Amino acid sequence: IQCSQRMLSFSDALLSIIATVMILPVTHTEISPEQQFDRSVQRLLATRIAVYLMTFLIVTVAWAAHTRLFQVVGKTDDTLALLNLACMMTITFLPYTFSLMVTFPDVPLGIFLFCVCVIAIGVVQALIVGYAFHFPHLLSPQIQEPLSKERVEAFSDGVYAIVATLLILDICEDNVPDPKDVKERFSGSLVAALSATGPRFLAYFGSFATVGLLWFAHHSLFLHVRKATRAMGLLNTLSLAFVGGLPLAYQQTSAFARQPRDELERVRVSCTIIFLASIFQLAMWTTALLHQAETLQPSVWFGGREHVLMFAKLALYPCASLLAFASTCLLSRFSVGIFHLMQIAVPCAFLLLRLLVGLALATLRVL
Amino acid sequence: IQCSQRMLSFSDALLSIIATVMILPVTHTEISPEQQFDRSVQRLLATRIAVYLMTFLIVTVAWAAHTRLFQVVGKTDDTLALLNLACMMTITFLPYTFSLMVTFPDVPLGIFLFCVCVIAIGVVQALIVGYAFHFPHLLSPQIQEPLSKERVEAFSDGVYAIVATLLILDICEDNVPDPKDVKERFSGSLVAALSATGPRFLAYFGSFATVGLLWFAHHSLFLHVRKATRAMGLLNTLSLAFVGGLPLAYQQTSAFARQPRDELERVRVSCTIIFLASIFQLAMWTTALLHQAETLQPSVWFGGREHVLMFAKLALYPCASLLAFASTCLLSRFSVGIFHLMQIAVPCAFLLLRLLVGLALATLRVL
Ligand SMILES: [K+]
Ligand SMILES: [K+]
Ligand SMILES: [K+]
Ligand SMILES: [K+]
């Protein structure tokens, strides 16, 4: 009999990769220069994004079914670890089969293969449960609504890291200048060939900063959480799903726009994505406050030395994204600039959030 | 003051992604049909593999410098977490700058940019240390040779998961049949279009199984480890570096070979890669046995109820890979088959290793 901690961490990493696989085709799409193509190149993008959102959800469901199974199987052995490897293998085929089923709706083979994948997942999990129940010492003591927060944090960590490094992976794979291109199109100066790739570096910088600071807010929240509810789990799943789309937003807001209207639309889309990624993070906190005596540590209750700080940490991005979006409709002429300032101001406000919250709590104390 | 566990886990995930970035260009290379191209298409591959091996090492060094810093900083805060995000950002640029420096050796800009990346890493770490020493309560109690095994396990887990799902990611991105191709080249049958992609699925199956079982051996070892030494860390780093090349081996041993000699050479290469990935795993155990009273739990000492099982679990792959390689030179005609049998036999031998070890310990007990 052995501890199951590391095996479940490995499973979480695999499940994060599998839930985020379908973001790569979305982010590998190109911006068409010919406007005649726009329509088509829009349609495809949408069809990809939808396939991502569904896929990330389906895998997440599997992840949940996993998390819950090994709350019934508290301890592992060699056979259980190997069968869990088998279950991970089966889960790894869900995205491909789902994409196949949606790409060929009329062909019956895709539905058949997706159903076979799901059935195989079920069979492997049944085998695990039967093995554990034939060796009762592998079952949890309570076996011999709640959701394990360790699994939640590991899954979220993996998703955040993938989304943060997505664009640097592409930069390393594709945008390393060729001596040939440097000798033909840039007159021999590698500085020029690298300057012609600056927009992609800007996109990666912005995306990494925003994703990492959203992870910072998530980490601050779950440091103060006692028990994670399935409601909080669904809210986190939605938040991560929308986090996945930040690299695309920053890749479009950094590429060239033929007309200013396009840049304004891009800013609006990016602000909407950030707001969606952050409002569900705030909703986790608000829902947890419904039953604070069980879900939160005493410090972050109504009347604690971390309640207001926590509220600020979770309400910063929603407010700033909403303000930028509003600027796109009220101060349009100064809107694109405001967004850029956000990218600098929001980090600083995190490095001084203690100070800013104290100042705001004193101002209203003298007003 | 807050616990630093999750922040370090997030850092480990990021560092694993960054250390494995350069395996993608190796695995995205194609097999040339024209033999005249072979030479060139060989050279490029080598130049890629080298760049991988160096890169994985450099990042690993950074990882080590990280692991060690936050053994001096036992507890974290908001500022420290944000500065750690900055340090991760800086580490994330090392592969690109190193590839740039090796691609343009004569241009001085690449050396300059790589040095700037390293210098920035150093500056951020100095800032972290100064912050911790100006707030002594953030320093470890011993501050107010050994290597943290938690970090080692997290890093290894991430690398293993990435290498295991590498090929399924490509299958999802590229090898989903197009209705167009199905209507033009496969006569409308999606079953045929999918059968024309079977080799890639076979490669993924084999690679995932082998990587996961190597992870199983690693997990079994480190369940029985007390303190991890830097010698063991270097051995693990070498093992993971060679693990990274398993997808390429399985992608070449499953593609078409013009002549049988090519298939034999491919089998030899794959066996060599597996042997390298596994012999350093066994070397970790052998080195730990040098000082068993400190590095290992009492069960796996010389004279325990897990010593022989552990030896078998770590010596299975080296022996089987060596045996297959030998078959390539003694039973050449039956060599390619033997390798395939290995892919089935080695998993089964893990599901029955208790039984097999008992039988072998009784046989020699009556001989
Ligand atoms: K973990
Ligand atoms: K990826
Ligand atoms: K971890
Ligand atoms: K990748």
Other beta carbons within 10 Å of B185: 12
Cβ pair A190:B110 closer than 8 A: yes
- Give the separation between CA B16 and CA B19, rounded to whole angstroms: 5
Kindly list the residues from chain B whose CB atom is less than 8 angstroms away from the CB atom of residue A300. none
Whether residue B104 contacts residue B113, with contact meaning beta carbons closer than 8 Å, is answered with: no
Whether residue A168 contacts residue B91, with contact meaning beta carbons closer than 8 Å, is answered with: no
Kindly list the residues from chain A whose CB atom is less than 8 angstroms away from the CB atom of residue B190. 100, 104, 107, 109-110
* Torsion angles phi and psi, residue A146, rounded to 5: -70, 155
Check if A201 contacts B (Cβ < 8 Å). no
Amino acid in position B298? P
Kindly list the residues from chain A whose CB atom is less than 8 angstroms away from the CB atom of residue B109. 190-191, 194
- Give the separation between CA A240 and CA A15, rounded to whole angstroms: 13
Check if A263 contacts B (Cβ < 8 Å). no
- Counted residue by residue, chain A has a size of 367
Alpha helix segments (H runs only) across chain B: 5-20, 23-27, 35-72, 78-91, 94-103, 109-134, 149-174, 179-184, 190-195, 198-223, 230-243, 246-252, 260-288, 292-295, 307-330, 335-351, 353-366
A2-3 and A75-76 as β-strands: parallel, antiparallel, unpaired?
A: antiparallel
Neighbours of ion ligand 1 (CB under 5 A): A 9, 154; B 9
DSSP class of residue B298 equals: G
User: To probe the interface with A, which of B28, B131, B168 has the most A CB atoms within 10 Å?
Assistant: B168
The resolution in angstroms reads 2.7
Check if B110 contacts A (Cβ < 8 Å). yes
Q: Is the dihedral of CA B232, B233, B237, B240 positive or negative?
A: positive
Check if B308 contacts A (Cβ < 8 Å). no
Amino acid in position A367? L
DSSP, collapsed to helix, strand or coil, labels residue B46 as helix
DSSP, collapsed to helix, strand or coil, labels residue A352 as coil
- Give the separation between CA A111 and CA A47, rounded to whole angstroms: 18
- Give the separation between CA A18 and CA B24, rounded to whole angstroms: 17
Check if B129 contacts A (Cβ < 8 Å). no
* Torsion angles phi and psi, residue B92, rounded to 5: -65, -15
Chain A, 147 to 186: residues with Cβ < 8 Å from chain B are 153-154, 157-158, 160-162, 164-165, 168-169, 171-173, 176-177, 179, 182
CA distances to B94, B120, B121, B350 from B116, in Å: 10, 6, 9, 48
Q: Tokens 């705001």 correspond to what residue?
A: A360
CA distances to A195, A266, A267, A351, B241 from A248, in Å: 21, 10, 12, 27, 31
- Give the separation between CA B229 and CA B147, rounded to whole angstroms: 5
Query: Quick one: closest CA in A to B211, which residue?
Result: A85
Solving technique for this entry? cryo-EM
Whether residue A207 contacts residue A246, with contact meaning beta carbons closer than 8 Å, is answered with: yes
Check if A54 contacts B (Cβ < 8 Å). no
CA distance B351 to chain A (A): 6
Cβ pair B89:A208 closer than 8 A: yes
Q: Tokens 């396939």 correspond to what residue?
A: A51
Question: Which residues are within 8 A (CB) of B178 and not within 5 positions of it... i.e. 6 or more apart?
Answer: none
Cβ pair B219:A171 closer than 8 A: no
Other beta carbons within 10 Å of A74: 18
Check if B28 contacts A (Cβ < 8 Å). yes
Other beta carbons within 10 Å of A183: 11
Long-range contacts from B28-36, C-beta under 8 angstroms, 24+ separation: B28/A173, B28/B170, B31/B252, B31/B255, B35/B258
- Counted residue by residue, chain B has a size of 367
Dmax over Cα atoms in chain B, in whole Å? 75
- Give the separation between CA B53 and CA A308, rounded to whole angstroms: 48
- Give the separation between CA A275 and CA A233, rounded to whole angstroms: 18
Chain B, 223 to 242: residues with Cβ < 8 Å from chain A are 223
Long-range contacts from B284-292, C-beta under 8 angstroms, 24+ separation: B284/B221, B284/B232, B284/B235, B284/B236, B284/B239, B285/B221, B285/B310, B285/B311, B285/B314, B287/B229, B287/B231, B287/B232, B287/B235, B288/B225, B288/B229, B288/B232
DSSP string, B132-185: HHHSGGGS-GGG--EE-HHHHHHHHHHHHHHHHHHHHHHHHHH-S--HHHHHHT
Whether residue B85 contacts residue A216, with contact meaning beta carbons closer than 8 Å, is answered with: yes
User: To probe the interface with B, which of A15, A151, A190, A213 has the most B CB atoms within 10 Å?
Assistant: A190
Among residues A2, A39, A271, the alpha carbon closest in space to that of B225 is found at: A2
Cβ pair A28:B190 closer than 8 A: no
Other beta carbons within 10 Å of B291: 11
Cβ pair B9:A220 closer than 8 A: no
Q: Is the dihedral of CA A280, A285, A286, A291 positive or negative?
A: positive
Angle between helices A149-174 and B5-20 (to 10 degrees): 30
CA distances to A102, A107, A116, A118 from A111, in Å: 9, 8, 9, 11
- Give the separation between CA A128 and CA B328, rounded to whole angstroms: 39
Per-residue tokens: B257: 């070979």
B75-76 and B146-147 as β-strands: parallel, antiparallel, unpaired?
A: unpaired
CA atoms within a 13 Å half-sphere pointing along the CA-CB vector of B135: 13
Question: Which residues are within 8 A (CB) of B205 and not within 5 positions of it... i.e. 6 or more apart?
Answer: A89
DSSP, collapsed to helix, strand or coil, labels residue B187 as coil
- Give the separation between CA A216 and CA A313, rounded to whole angstroms: 9
CA distances to A53, A94, A158, A211, A322 from A20, in Å: 10, 12, 10, 14, 27
Amino acid in position B132? A
Buried b (16+ CB within 10 A) or exposed e, B337-359: ebbeebbeebbebbeebeebbee
CA distances to B16, B123, B239 from B63, in Å: 9, 16, 16
CA atoms within a 13 Å half-sphere pointing along the CA-CB vector of B35: 4
Query: Quick one: closest CA in A to B207, which residue?
Result: A89
Among residues B16, B47, B57, the alpha carbon closest in space to that of B151 is found at: B16
CA atoms within a 13 Å half-sphere pointing along the CA-CB vector of B253: 28
Share in percent of chain A as helix, strand, coil (round to 5): 80, 5, 15
DSSP, collapsed to helix, strand or coil, labels residue B75 as strand
Kindly list the residues from chain B whose CB atom is less than 8 angstroms away from the CB atom of residue A81. 216, 219
CA distance A291 to chain B (A): 23
Whether residue B276 contacts residue B242, with contact meaning beta carbons closer than 8 Å, is answered with: yes
Query: Quick one: closest CA in A to B81, which residue?
Result: A216
Question: Which residues are within 8 A (CB) of A23 and not within 5 positions of it... i.e. 6 or more apart?
Answer: A52, A56, A162, A163, A166, A244, A245, A247
